[model samples]
Target chain A: RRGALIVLEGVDRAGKSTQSRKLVEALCAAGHRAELLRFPERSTEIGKLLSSYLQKKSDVEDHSVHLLFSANRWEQVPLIKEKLSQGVTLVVDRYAFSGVAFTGAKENFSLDWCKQPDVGLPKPDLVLFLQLQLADAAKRGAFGHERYENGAFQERALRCFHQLMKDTTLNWKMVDASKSIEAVHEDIRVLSEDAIATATEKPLGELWK
Target chain B: RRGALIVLEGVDRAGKSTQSRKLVEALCAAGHRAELLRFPERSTEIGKLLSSYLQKKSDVEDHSVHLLFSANRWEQVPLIKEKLSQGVTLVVDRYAFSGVAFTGAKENFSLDWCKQPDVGLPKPDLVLFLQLQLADAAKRGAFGHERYENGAFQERALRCFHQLMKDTTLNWKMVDASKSIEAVHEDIRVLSEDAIATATEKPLGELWK
Candidate 1:
């Protein structure tokens, strides 16, 4: 049986990192083969370019930046496939939803256009979208130095995320990220287990069709 | 009057470089503010990644590579727009056509999908496709060390280019690349001047609408 590909998605500081790590740790402790990965891996050559763009060390056009973010995820397709085939569950912190949401929030950018680059990427069996109000999200560390940290942009991005939730193609589960860290992890852990069992019986699916 | 965006597109070793340089030189010598540019710019951060992929020094997924190539061009949009607006004619070696043609030739990749990323890019005033028989192209210095240099792949790319030519929207003028360098340049120079005059009167148009 293949392992599950579970993705965590939401606005920044939505406890995605914490819950993703906790889910992986809990899964492994329970004798499950689980590992954690994050988006914009930042280690590959493409990722280095994305890292520079996100940190404001270099300038990238908005459309190009959106494609670059998608490229960063596409670059990992082989590894993701191999790990899943080897019966290793991948707990990804952020995935294509974040890529589309953040970039699609920009003015004059279409979410439809943003979704094209990642059209056939590996689909997640379960996508845990950490739901947090902008008010609560802002209170978490006051937005870091990464690009798209401001309030106005975040509000738009949050709207974009909600738009993505309407996608019937993805198995998105809403999680209350405003809750305590442990509480969020427990919700994620239970959902992840169900997804893993269901996914083990089915073949891996391509994203967006 | 704004300057023309003239693009030269064809398979590898179709003399895009020589003709592009000659056109720029001829335009400049005639007191036109003309400059030459090439795709996979190989200088920027994204370009460095593409350069490594072309050189086979690094591995990138096909889909990601396609997006990176498009991103490479998108990164240059601002500069391209600025140059044309400043009345500087640009003789480009390749443009979005090559990006779509080469990548779309790959198995299971859709040309329609390939065209998406570059859909709204800056449209060219004139596209001079250097038409050459595969035999004639094979005679010119064989092939380079680039990734898409093999004859079989080049043939598929040529077929893809022909498919793209069926679109009546692009102002495509096929030049006999098998002719002498002076003859080819003469043809390109005449057509480019006409395009420049025509484009000067019209507002800049977006690619593929």
Candidate 2:
């Protein structure tokens, strides 16, 4: 029996990291095997390039940077498959949705074109989209000093994220991020548990199929 | 007036390096502005990752590596476009053709899928395919001890190269690479000169459109 692949996606400071970690821990405490993974893992050679680009330490063409972000996820496919096959539920933070949303938000790019490179990637059993108003996100904390942290760009990326969720095949749940962190984690925890219960008997699905 | 993008492509030991150098030199000597470039350039951040993978010093997934190779080229789009717009005829040793041919030769990959990431890249005005029998290629020199240097893989890549040439919409010319250095150089020189003359008044094309 394989484990579910659950993904948490939202804008920065929307508690993706905090909620992802809590969901994994709760799953493990409940006697379910679970682990956490993040996109742009930032440790591999390809990831180093993405890290530099995201931090504004290096400049890369928009198309090239988008591909690099996808490659960073591709580099981790083996490990991801292995863990899921071993009955470990994998909670991913900011997977391909973030790739498409952020890069597609840039000028002269389309969401469809941005989704091409990641077409056959492993599809998550459940995608929990944390929904927060831009004004609410701004009030929680100041955006980080990364490339896509501006309010204007975040607004564009939010729309792109909405566009990505229009697909009807994959499981998508919208959680209100305007709530407290504990409340958000509780919502994610329940969704992840339900997905893990249902996913153990099914074969993994491909993304953007 | 824009300059031509002339690419020399073939298997290893087919005199791409030698002929590319000679063509650029002869063009400059004839008072035509010209420059030379090569793929897997092995200098930029992305290039270094490809270098480590090619040299077998590091391991990466095949899909990831292919995307990385495309990114290495994408990283140079600005420079390539700049040179062409500046009336500097660019003689490239390899381009998207090599990316498609080599990666598409791998198992479970398709030429069309491999061509997607590079679809919108700048198209060459003329592609001079250095045609040499595999046996002749082996006779010229021992294949380098690189990742894709083996005979079996080279044969598969050659077949993939043939499939790519079937498009017929782009300018594709097969040059007999089984000739002496001066002989091949002259053939490339005439083809390049004609392409430069014709390309100056034309708009740059997009690959795989």
Candidate 3:
């Protein structure tokens, strides 16, 4: 009765957290052990630094920011494995995908360089990519509050996410984020159940292994 | 007329800064363009955050801080490459060796994991390891200022440094750092000139490439 480690990924204002919460609620209502998590957890020691960086109260060099994101995620791995082992599903709001995509989108950093620090992180059994447009994302209520909120940064990150999508081996589902939240929610509910079912059949695998 | 990239490594009070400074002065006087540099360069945006961590103004998770150090170095790679390409010899106080050794020595990290992110950084032509006794280093004036100035940390870092020396292909030389500064300076001068003379004959290489 193992559980699934599912990840929600996309640009800012993509309604990732909102949909992720719903997915976890649906899972538990279906009588499964389900939980919710988010990256840049922003509550631990590393999370504090990540918060500073995200708030633009501090600006670290590019690679430093990238590694901070990775280390923050790495600290959560054992806990992640433990949760999945106990038949409790984890619906992560964002994980390594955001790290690689945001950093990889920047100039002077090859996607390879961004990916190296996070190699072998626990890969998600289901990656629900909430594909949102730059123009539309900016119009959302949550846009323009953070360092990476601008279209310039978001555009690059979008391209990087697209590049990641090309890997072909990932358990990817393209969720058009532009749709109504209920529409996205329905798709996520159906897809998440299938993934949770299959995840119990296989051992959890590390990312980019 | 490429310039040699020479790195000086040791525990605190091992004369890395003093010796590297004198080495650069003499190299410039001898008419080869030479300069001194240090990592966690404290001037860039990433460096400022590193300083905050070192000064105890902020507490960061271990692995996050480690990536900050590595990212600090990576940002300088292009500039390091440009300097060497333009025949500017670099007498660097610390580089990847210190980053890997110090962070790798800590709990919850592998030496291999610490080394991965820095794989393609511009490699040094020579590493002058100032081998000093931990007892002797503890007595030196500059001890106990930063977070990494403890016996246990130094002991582990020293072990990692020796492991790096065994890489054989790295052109490492063990110098008795307990010797007088002039003696160490003289030894560095001779070996440095040899490195600088041959540097132009070979293309610059990348770390662990």
Comparison by lDDT, 1 against 3, better one:
1
lDDT of 2 by residue, B1-209 (tens): 89899999986688999999999999999999999999988998889888988988888899998998898888899999999999889999889999999998899887767888887899999999999998998888786757988999999999999988888878999999999999999999998999999866888998887
Error of 1 at B103 (Å): 1.1
Q: Cα RMSD to native, each candidate?
A: 1.3, 1.3, 4.6
lDDT values, one for every candidate: 0.90, 0.89, 0.84
lDDT of 1 by residue, A113-184 (tens): 889999999889999899888788777877778888888998899899888899898898999888999988
The TM-score measured for candidate 1 stands at: 0.97
lDDT of model 2, residue B117: 85
TM-score of 3: 0.76
Off by over 4 Å in 1: none
Residue range A1-209, candidate 2, lDDT tens digits? 89899999986578889899989889999999889999889997778878888899988898899899999899899999999899989999889999999988889787777888898899999999988878877787787868988989988999999888899988999999889989888888887787888765779999987
lDDT of predicted model 3 = 0.84
Pairs in clash, predicted candidate 1: none
Lowest-sum lDDT 10-residue window in model 3 chain B:
B137-146
Off by over 4 Å in 3: A1-4, A10-18, A21-65, A68-90, A101-112, A120-125, A131-180, A193-209, B139-145
For this target, which candidate reaches the highest lDDT against the unseen true structure?
1
